[PDB]
Specification:
The complex is a heterotrimer of chains A (196), B (223) and C (214). Chain A has 196 residues and is mainly β. In chain A, 9% of the residues lie in helices and 26% in strands. Chain A is globular, with a radius of gyration of 18 Å. Chain A starts with 5 loop residues before the first helix and ends with a strand. Chain B has no helices and 21 strands. The chains are: A mainly beta (196), B mainly beta (223), C mainly beta (214). Chains in contact: A-B, A-C, B-C. The structure holds a molecule of 3 linked components (NAG-NAG-BMA). A molecule of 3 linked components (NAG-NAG-BMA) binds next to helix 1 of chain A. Chain A: This is Spike protein S1.
Chain lengths: 196, 223, 214
C-alpha cells in the first residue's frame, strides 16, 4: 500500500552538511522498520529510548528523519549528552531522546581526488546549540575584543570550515552519512504504524 | 553542561547505616536516557563500583556489595542517593557519583548502559566513634621572597578546605596533607609564597572550611 | 567475573618522554574498555572510551588502543600536568571492575628548597600549646631530612612531617615539619633552629629565630 518514504531518506543522492542538516517529516503511512535493522550495510545503529525490535508494535504521530554528513570519528558525537564540535555547534540531541541513529561509510560517494570541500561544519559559536537547533548564520565570530563587522582577520574567523574528504584518508576522516529517526507522539492521533 | 554535587555525613559509626546523596544540576534525571551511579575509593586505594540506577528505578549493583546497599532516585528533587548498611571500618572512603553515557539498544535489541561519562567531586565519609570538632586557626606571620600561611590544628574528621583571598589568590599556594597527631585530631598547614613587596599593601586572608562540624574561619595574616 | 590487571604499578619518566600503560582483561571484553585519569585530590576524568576513542577536550597526546583482552593507554609526549593515577575500567555487561591503578610520577632535574620558618603565633600561645613551623618549598627529589634543635638540644619525638604531591606545573615537592610542645616548655628556651639537609644543597642550610622578636 502506502509505505513510508524511507528509501527517499537513506537512498538519497544528495546529503546536507551537518551544520545545515535536513529534516524530513514522515506521517500518514506504514513503515517497515525490519528493512533497516535487518541489515549489516550500516556501520552504527543505536536506538535510544525504544528497542528496534519493539518498533513494529508501536505507533507514532510523526517520525522525523534528520540526515547529514560528518567524518567517522564524529559519529560518536551523535548521541544524547555528548560533547565536541559536532555535538555542541551542529546537531545536539536532547537528554530524553526517543529515536535511532543510523550511519554508514560513504567514502566511495563523498570523496573526490584532491578533496571534497563541499561539506562544511560549524567550528565556532558563542553558545552551545539547543537540542534540535539548526544554525546556518555565517556571521563572523569575534574571538577577541575587535568587532569584526563582516570582515575576516586577526581574531575574526568565518565560522564554517570545510571537511575536505580525500579517498586516501584514514577511516577516522572519511565521510559518513547519518540518519537520525525521531519517534515523536504528541497530542495528535497515531498515524505512523507498522505492518499486520 | 551537566554537573553533580555530593552531600553526606562527615562521619558515621561502626555497624550503623551510611547515607549520601547527589544533586544533579544543569540537566534533569527525569526521562533522561542515562544511568546514574556511585563509585567509592577508600583512602589511598583504587576505585570500586557500587551500583547505578535509571530514572525508572531499575538498578544494577556490584555483586560483592549487593545486600549491604540499595540506591534510589527522587526524580522530583533531581537527586539520587545511596544507603550502605552495617558499616565496617573498611568502608571509609570518598564516595563519587557519576553520569553514564547515554544508554542505547543495538540493532539486535541488546541493552548497554555504557561508561562513566561525568564525575562529581566526591564526599569523604569516615567510619569512626569520635568527637566531630572544628579547627583552631592561628596565623603564620611572615630579595622579594615572602612566605605566609595558616595553621589549622586539631580538627576531626577529614576534610578541611583552604583558599586564599576567597579564591582570588591561587598561584603559588601549597596546602599540605593532614597529619594525624597522636591526640586523634588532624593537623595541617597551608602556606603561600608572595612577592615581599606585598607584605603591607595587599590583604592576605585564608578561607578555612571544615564541613563535618559546620565551621568557617577567616584569619588575616600580617607581619 | 572479569578481573583487570594493570601494569605497571608505578612509573617514573621525564618530560617529553613517551609512556604506555597496559591493561589485561581476564576474559574478552570486545572494545568495552575506558581509561580514567585522576590528578591528586580530584575526581577521575574520562580519557578514552570504546578502547580507543578520545573524549572531547582531552589532549591529543593521549591515545588508547587494544581489543579483546589486551589494551594500552599511551601518553605520546609526557607533560608535568600529566602526573596522576591512571585507571582502566571494563564496561562489558553490567559487572564493572577497575584496574589497581598506574601511578605516574615525573622525573625531574635536582632542585633545592627555599626554606622558611614561622614562629608560633600570639593567639595560639594563649591556648597553652606552641608549634614551630619549618617549611621546605619547591625542591626535588622528595628525600629530605629536617632536624629540630632548641638551643642545640637535638629534638626527638616532638615533630611530625608532611610531604606534598608533585606539582602540576613544575613537578617539585614541598615539605612541612612542625614541632609542638607545651607553652610551659616553649618559653624555657631562646634559639629555635630547624636544620634542612638536602641533596640540592652544598651543605645543610639552617633557618632559625629567637623567641619573641629576638
Ligand atoms: C536502498 O537501495 C538498495 C538497492 O536497491 C536496497 O538494498 C536492497 O534492498 C532490496 C529490498 O529490500 C533487497 O532485495 C532483497 O533480495 C534478496 C535476494 O535474495 C533477499 O535477501 C530479500 O528478500 C529482498 O527481496 C536487496 O538484497 C538489497 N541489496 C543490498 C545490497 O542490500 C535498500 O533496501 C534501499 N534502502 C532502503 C532504506 O530502502
Amino acid at each position: 500500500t502506502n509505505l513510508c518514504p524511507f528509501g527517499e531518506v537513506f537512498n538519497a543522492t544528495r546529503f546536507a552538511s551537518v551544520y545545515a542538516w535536513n529534516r524530513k517529516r514522515i506521517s500518514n503511512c506504514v513503515a517497515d522498520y525490519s528493512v533497516l535493522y535487518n541489515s549489516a550495510s550500516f556501520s552504527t545503529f543505536k536506538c535510544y529510548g525504544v528497542s528496534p525490535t519493539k518498533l513494529n508494535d508501536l505507533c507514532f504521530t510523526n517520525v522525523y528523519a534528520d540526515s547529514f554528513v560528518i567524518r567517522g570519528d564524529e559519529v560518536r558525537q551523535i548521541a544524547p549528552g555528548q560533547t565536541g564540535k559536532i555535538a555542541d555547534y551542529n546537531y545536539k540531541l536532547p537528554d530524553d531522546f526517543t529515536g535511532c541513529v543510523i550511519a554508514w561509510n560513504s567514502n566511495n560517494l563523498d570523496s573526490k581526488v584532491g578533496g571534497n570541500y563541499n561539506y562544511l561544519y560549524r567550528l565556532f559559536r558563542k553558545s552551545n546549540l539547543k537540542p534540535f537547533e539548526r544554525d546556518i548564520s555565517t556571521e563572523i565570530y569575534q574571538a577577541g575584543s575587535t568587532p569584526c563587522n563582516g570582515v575576516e582577520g586577526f581574531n575574526c574567523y568565518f565560522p564554517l570550515q570545510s571537511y575536505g574528504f580525500q579517498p586516501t584518508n584514514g577511516v577516522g576522516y572519511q565521510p559518513y552519512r547519518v540518519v537520525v529517526l525521531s519517534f515523536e507522539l504528541l497530542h495528535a492521533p497515531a498515524t505512523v504504524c507498522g505492518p499486520k | 553542561q551537566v554537573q553533580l554535587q555530593e552531600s553526606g555525613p562527615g562521619l558515621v559509626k561502626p555497624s550503623e547505616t551510611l547515607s549520601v546523596t547527589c544533586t544533579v544540576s544543569g540537566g534533569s534525571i527525569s526521562s533522561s536516557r542515562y544511568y546514574w551511579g556511585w563509585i567509592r575509593q577508600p583512602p589511598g586505594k583504587g576505585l570500586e563500583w557500587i551500583g547505578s540506577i535509571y530514572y525508572s528505578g531499575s538498578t544494577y549493583y556490584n555483586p560483592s556489595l549487593k545486600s549491604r546497599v540499595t540506591i534510589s532516585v527522587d526524580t522530583s528533587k533531581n537527586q539520587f542517593s545511596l544507603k550502605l548498611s552495617s558499616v565496617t571500618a573498611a568502608d571509609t572512603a570518598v564516595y563519587y557519583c557519576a553520569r553514564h553515557a547515554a544508554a542505547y539498544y543495538d540493532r539486535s535489541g541488546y541493552y548497554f548502559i555504557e561508561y562513566f561519562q561525568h564525575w562529581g567531586q566526591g564526599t569523604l565519609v569516615t567510619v569512626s566513634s569520635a568527637s566531630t570538632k572544628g579547627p583552631s586557626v592561628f596565623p603564620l606571620a611572615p630579595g622579594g621572597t615572602a612566605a605566609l600561611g595558616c595553621l589549622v590544628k586539631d580538627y576531626f574528621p577529614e576534610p578541611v578546605t583552604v583558599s586564599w583571598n576567597s579564591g582570588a589568590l591561587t598561584s603559588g599556594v601549597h596546602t599540605f596533607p593532614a597529619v594525624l597527631q597522636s591526640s586523634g585530631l588532624y593537623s595541617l598547614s597551608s602556606v603561600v609564597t608572595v612577592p615581599s613587596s606585598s607584605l603591607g599593601t595587599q590583604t592576605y586572608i585564608c578561607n578555612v572550611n571544615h564541613k563535618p562540624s559546620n565551621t568557617k574561619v577567616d584569619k588575616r595574616v600580617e607581619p | 567475573d572479569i578481573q583487570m590487571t594493570q601494569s605497571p604499578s608505578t612509573l617514573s619518566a621525564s618530560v617529553g618522554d613517551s609512556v604506555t600503560i597496559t591493561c589485561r582483561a581476564s576474559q574478552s571484553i570486545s572494545s568495552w574498555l575506558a581509561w580514567y585519569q585522576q590528578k591528586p585530590g580530584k575526581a577521575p576524568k574520562l580519557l578514552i572510551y570504546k578502547a580507543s576513542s578520545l573524549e572531547s577536550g582531552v589532549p591529543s597526546r593521549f591515545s588508547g588502543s587494544g581489543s579483546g583482552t589486551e589494551f594500552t593507554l599511551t601518553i605520546s609526549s609526557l607533560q608535568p600536568d600529566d602526573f596522576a593515577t591512571y585507571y582502566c575500567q571494563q564496561y562489558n555487561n553490567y559487572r564493572y571492575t577497575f584496574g589497581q591503578g598506574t601511578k605516574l610520577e615525573i622525573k625531574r632535574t635536582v632542585a633545592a628548597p627555599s626554606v622558611f620558618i614561622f614562629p608560633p603565633s600570639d593567639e595560639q600561645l594563649k591556648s597553652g600549646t606552641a608549634s614551630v613551623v619549618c617549611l621546605l618549598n619547591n625542591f626535588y627529589p622528595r628525600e629530605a631530612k629536617v632536624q629540630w634543635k632548641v638551643d642545640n638540644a637535638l629534638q626527638s619525638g616532638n615533630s611530625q612531617e608532611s610531604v606534598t604531591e608533585q606539582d602540576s606545573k613544575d613537578s617539585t615537592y614541598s615539605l612541612s615539619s612542625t614541632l609542638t610542645l607545651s607553652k610551659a616548655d616553649y618559653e624555657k628556651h631562646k634559639v629555635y633552629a630547624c636544620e634542612v639537609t638536602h641533596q640540592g644543597l652544598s651543605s645543610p642550610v639552617t633557618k632559625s629565630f629567637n623567641r619573641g622578636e629576638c
